[PDB]
């Protein structure tokens, strides 16, 4: 599947575009590659996991998200648990440890590693043949002496996605995210970060 997404961030006063290609294999392997651009008025991420079928409803996915930026490489081993409660309702939970392969100045001025503990919760609800609603909730916290742009050692994200199944292989969507007070505009941080996004996913 190919996903193209454009987004506006209200606190950062910035536009971002994501181009993403993802595929599940019948042997259980799954992978994704994406690029994200950032235009104030950049990253590449590779994700791989393996789907362990516990039964017809339950799947465990050991995986890793590798994140490439100009600062360097960040490795995010994870485990995701997925439950298809019904054909129309799926729940998911993931814990990921984001470990930076590069050292950065911490809040005390010492060189350390800005590693992160990250949890995501997922609910996907196929409302009817036309629409699917998905919510992803996220909590991450710092392992070491660093902070987020909200002046805390932790922050949240909440992503709300409405997908319209126009075609069986074309799915336009709209999305609203609240990314905590993590907006940064001209060195000034602690801004409310609303995120408004529109995209479309294309199946083969
Ligand atoms: C899923 C990998 C677990 C890594 C946790 C490390 C905590 C210091
Ligand atoms: C068994 C996983 C529960 C997922 C919680 C959903 C939070 C949006
Ligand atoms: C179609 C009306 C029910 C949809 C609400 C469920 C959560 C988005
Ligand atoms: C079912 C949608 C949940 C919305 C949560 C909003 C949290 C402030």
Curated annotation (Swiss-Prot):
Regions that span the bilayer: 2-8, 16-25, 29-37, 43-52, 58-68, 74-83, 89-98, 118-125, 131-139, 157-166, 170-178, 195-202
Catalytic activity field = N-acetylneuraminate(in) = N-acetylneuraminate(out)
Query: What is known about its subunit structure?
Result: Monomer.
Is the Repressor keyword given for this protein? Answer: no
Picking any one GO biological process from the record gives:
oligosaccharide transport
Annotated organism of origin: Escherichia coli (strain K12)
Q: Where does this chain mainly localize?
A: membrane
What membrane topology does the annotation report for this chain?
Answer: Multi-pass membrane protein
Per the UniProt topology annotation, the Extracellular ranges are 9-15, 69-73, 99-117, 140-156, 179-194
* Record key words, sorted: Cell outer membrane, Ion transport, Membrane, Porin, Signal, Sugar transport, Transmembrane, Transmembrane beta strand, Transport
Compartment list? Cell outer membrane
Keyword match 4Fe-4S: no
Its recorded name reads N-acetylneuraminic acid outer membrane channel protein NanC
Mind naming one GO cellular-component term on file for this protein? pore complex
Question: In terms of domain of life, where is this protein from?
Answer: Bacteria
Gene that this sequence comes from: nanC
Q: Extract one GO molecular function annotation from the record.
A: porin activity
What is known about its induction? Induced by N-acetylneuraminate and modulated by N-acetylglucosamine. This regulation occurs via the NanR and NagC regulators. NanC expression is also activated by the regulators cyclic AMP-catabolite activator protein, OmpR, and CpxR.
Q: Give residue ranges on the Periplasmic side.
A: 26-28, 53-57, 84-88, 126-130, 167-169, 203-204
